[PDB]
């Protein structure tokens, strides 16, 4: 039969309709009054969290992060530039907002490692994402068959090197064939043309 | 008053001093920042790739 | 070119800042719970560096000693009141609603409780004209009819120091001393007297703006100089 989780899932396919609509209208009022990174006891989208690796266990942390909406916040050129490199307004950054959110969260919790993240809406001037972080130093986690992999030394600061799911997608690593000629195995090795 | 010799006589201010962190006489005692190693400005050590030829 | 002086101003460097560390206080009305049971006595008259006008130090019943924006005619010993039931006399503060029409007031609040925004300069005053249950009409010093919340507080009378403007500075040195008490760069070098690199009007064999002075409202900073969006110029017509 349908899991209770599927109901949370199905509700979020249209965050603008039904009860969820009312919840968001109510919630965001409080979120707007919260900081940039607020730790929270429980995921707002349980099905998503569990699906991404979340577990109700010691060493598993969830935090909501908000980031200003829109394109790049760039300063116009103070030195000579050819028309091409004079743009300022319509230029956007190469990292999506979710990635910026994952990094801020990870900065707030220096000892934790980003496991994954997902969206929880936005208003006209900002977007919110909840990030799942794991404590690689807690025994409850060092002994987990599903999460202990994140305790390895080469997993340290994984978010800052683009090793997150959002990181890999944003680096154009989804496709295994056509279109990934310059993304795999890394943007840098391909001369940075991906 | 000329900008040369006559103006050099007014120089008796102490700015750069021996730095606690790196030992170079580069700790600006008025800014409390080392122009050589970055002490007072950054926990990380002051460094730049332009301090050497690009391919070296 | 180089940024014009008006642009250097915005960075808020020392040269353009007001000597705030030398200023006394921001003569904002006292906050009263209600009842109006708040009265104090003028303990002294002082000079206000930021406005070149006198200010009165008042000691209130509940023990609060604060400077106040004094109207003309307030002296030591006098007793002032601040509240809805305050008596209708010079130097007293109360909401416009309580003020009788045709009475000159000063230090008028823009939004009830802000502390006073209008008519604060030497010898000026707003004129309370129309009353109502929804809007109090005041005539500001510039002659503009302003619609205000009758709940906006004000002080009866005109501001002290009137006529300050009637005497000429006579010499640069006097202007100098006053300018040193404000957030202003003085003296003033004419734009036409500068190099082209320094101002839209600079350059040229003889001095003259090489363009019409009336600049558009939409002009970007650096170019908005001269007569800003003038509806007209001159004295004629």
């Amino acid at each position: 039969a349908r899991s209770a989780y599927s109901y949370i899932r199905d509700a979020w396919e249209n965050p603008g309709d039904g009860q969820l609509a009312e919840l968001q209208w109510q919630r965001q009022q409080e979120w707007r009054n919260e900081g940039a990174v607020e730790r929270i006891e429980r995921p707002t989208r349980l099905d998503k969290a569990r699906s991404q690796g979340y577990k109700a266990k010691q060493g598993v942390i969830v935090a909501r992060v908000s980031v200003r909406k829109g394109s790049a916040r760039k300063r116009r050129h103070k030195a000579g530039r050819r028309s091409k490199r004079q743009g300022v307004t319509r230029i956007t950054r190469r990292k999506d907002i979710q990635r910026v959110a994952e990094e801020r969260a990870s900065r707030t919790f220096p000892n934790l490692r980003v496991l994954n993240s997902y969206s929880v809406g936005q208003d006209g001037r900002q977007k919110w994402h909840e990030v799942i972080l794991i404590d690689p130093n807690h025994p409850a986690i060092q002994n987990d068959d599903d999460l202990s992999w994140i305790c390895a030394d080469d997993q340290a600061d994984r978010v800052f090197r683009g090793l997150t799911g959002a990181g890999r997608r944003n680096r154009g690593l989804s496709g295994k064939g056509k279109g990934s000629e310059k993304t795999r195995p890394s943007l840098r090795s391909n001369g940075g043309k991906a | 008053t000329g900008a040369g010799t006559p103006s050099q006589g007014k120089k008796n201010t102490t700015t750069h001093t021996k730095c606690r962190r790196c030992g170079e006489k580069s700790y600006h005692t008025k800014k409390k920042v080392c122009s050589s190693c970055g002490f007072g400005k950054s926990a990380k050590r002051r460094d730049y790739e332009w301090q050497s030829k690009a391919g070296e | 070119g180089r940024r014009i002086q008006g642009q250097r101003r915005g960075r808020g460097t020392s040269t353009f800042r007001a000597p705030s560390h030398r200023y006394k206080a921001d003569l904002e009305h006292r906050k009263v719970e209600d009842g109006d049971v708040i009265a104090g006595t003028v303990v002294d008259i002082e000079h206000d560096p930021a406005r070149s006008a006198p200010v009165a130090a008042v000691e209130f019943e509940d023990g609060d000693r604060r400077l106040i924006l004094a109207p003309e005619g307030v002296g030591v010993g006098d007793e002032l009141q601040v509240g809805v039931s305050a008596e209708i006399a010079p130097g007293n503060t109360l909401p416009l609603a309580e003020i009788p029409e045709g009475v000159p007031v000063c230090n008028v609040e823009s939004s009830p409780g802000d502390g006073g925004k209008f008519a604060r300069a030497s010898g000026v005053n707003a004129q309370l004209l129309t009353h109502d249950r929804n809007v109090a009409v005041v005539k500001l010093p510039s002659g503009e009819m302003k619609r205000l919340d009758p709940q906006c507080r004000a002080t009866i009378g005109v501001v002290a120091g009137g006529g300050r403007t009637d005497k000429p500075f006579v010499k640069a040195g006097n202007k100098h001393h006053k300018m040193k008490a404000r957030g202003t760069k003085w003296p003033n070098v004419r734009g036409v007297a500068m190099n082209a690199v320094d101002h839209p009007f600079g350059g040229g064999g003889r001095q003259h703006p090489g363009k019409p002075k009336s600049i558009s409202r939409n002009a970007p900073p650096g170019r908005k100089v001269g007569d800003i969006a003038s509806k007209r110029t001159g004295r004629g017509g």
Binding site: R82, S83, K84, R85, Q86, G87, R90, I91 | - | -
Partner: protein, 92 residues
Amino acid sequence: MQMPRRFNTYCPHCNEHQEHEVEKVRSGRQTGMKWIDRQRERNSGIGNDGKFSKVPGGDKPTKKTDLKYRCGECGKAHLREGWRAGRLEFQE
């Protein structure tokens, strides 16, 4: 100059002389779906857009005749070199 609306001449299709009607070539409308149209969009962005920033050239004092010759029996037309003519008016 004057030009007869119809006259006998060689029709390269029937491969024999037949009566033709002369008409000035009317400009066909563009679709905006040609390769060049897509290149202009793909290559135009911020700043100068190379060739797509160039604007229409001038004019020659006189243009060459631009006509269609339609065979009166097979209905098919053919083109011919044109010749500079300040004005071209048809007779009848």
